[PDB]
């Protein structure tokens, strides 16, 4: 179900990421470096466990989860959240909850590119990844 998302992906476009980070309370210096960073995202499965790595010259993260099963997560900006990832309309939807707040990280495939839409508050960021061979 999740197989077309699997592999290694490289950031090739970013819109409104500063808006998104600022909504989350990320400090100006972190936003400044992040705005010039191009992460690599690696999505792997082993049975129904998915592992999603984000690698960069600035911050690295890694999460493992089962679709539809809540997990604890500590984000790149150091939020401690309750998370769930599910498939919805063919999109990989990651919902994070903390302190009554929520953010969604939605991944979809369009013309072979991986489009990540990040929403928090009114901020909507779109980041595009292309697949590495
Ligand atoms: C990984 C780049 C550094 C961002 C660090 C501070 C903001 C983190 C915000 C939450 C995570 C965003 C992930 C964006 C993405 O995977 O392209």
Curated annotation (Swiss-Prot):
PROSITE patterns: FABP. Coiled coil: none annotated. The modification N-acetylvaline is found at residue 2. Keywords: Acetylation, Cytoplasm, Lipid-binding, Phosphoprotein, Transport. The modification Phosphoserine is found at residues 23, 83. InterPro entries: Calycin (IPR012674), Fatty_acid-bd (IPR000463), ILBP (IPR031259), Lipocln_cytosolic_FA-bd_dom (IPR000566). One of its GO terms (molecular function) is cytoskeletal protein binding. CDD domains: FABP3 (cd19466). Octadecanoate binds at residues 127-129. Hexadecanoate binds at residues 127-129. It is found in: Cytoplasm. (9Z)-octadecenoate binds at residues 127-129. GO terms for biological process: brown fat cell differentiation; cholesterol homeostasis; fatty acid metabolic process; intracellular lipid transport; long-chain fatty acid transport; negative regulation of cell population proliferation; phospholipid homeostasis; positive regulation of long-chain fatty acid import into cell. The modification Phosphotyrosine is found at residue 20. The modification Phosphothreonine is found at residues 8, 30. It comes from the Eukaryota. GO terms for cellular component: cytosol; extracellular exosome; extracellular space; nucleus; sarcoplasm. Pfam families: Lipocalin (PF00061). Forms a beta-barrel structure that accommodates the hydrophobic ligand in its interior. Belongs to the calycin superfamily. Fatty-acid binding protein (FABP) family. FABPs are thought to play a role in the intracellular transport of long-chain fatty acids and their acyl-CoA esters. This is Fatty acid-binding protein, heart. It comes from Homo sapiens.
């Amino acid at each position: 179900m999740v197989d077309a998302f699997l592999g290694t992906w490289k950031l090739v476009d970013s819109k409104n990421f500063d808006d998104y980070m600022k909504s989350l309370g990320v400090g100006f210096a972190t936003r400044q470096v992040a705005s010039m960073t191009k992460p690599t995202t690696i999505i792997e499965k082993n049975g129904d466990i998915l592992t999603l790595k984000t690698h960069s010259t600035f911050k690295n993260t890694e999460i493992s989860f089962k679709l539809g099963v809540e997990f604890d997560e500590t984000t790149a900006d150091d939020r401690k959240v309750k998370s769930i990832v599910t498939l919805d309309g063919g999109k990989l939807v990651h919902l994070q909850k903390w302190d009554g707040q929520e953010t969604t990280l939605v991944r979809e495939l369009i013309d072979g590119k991986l489009i990540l839409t990040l929403t928090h508050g009114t901020a909507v960021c779109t980041r595009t990844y292309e697949k590495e061979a």
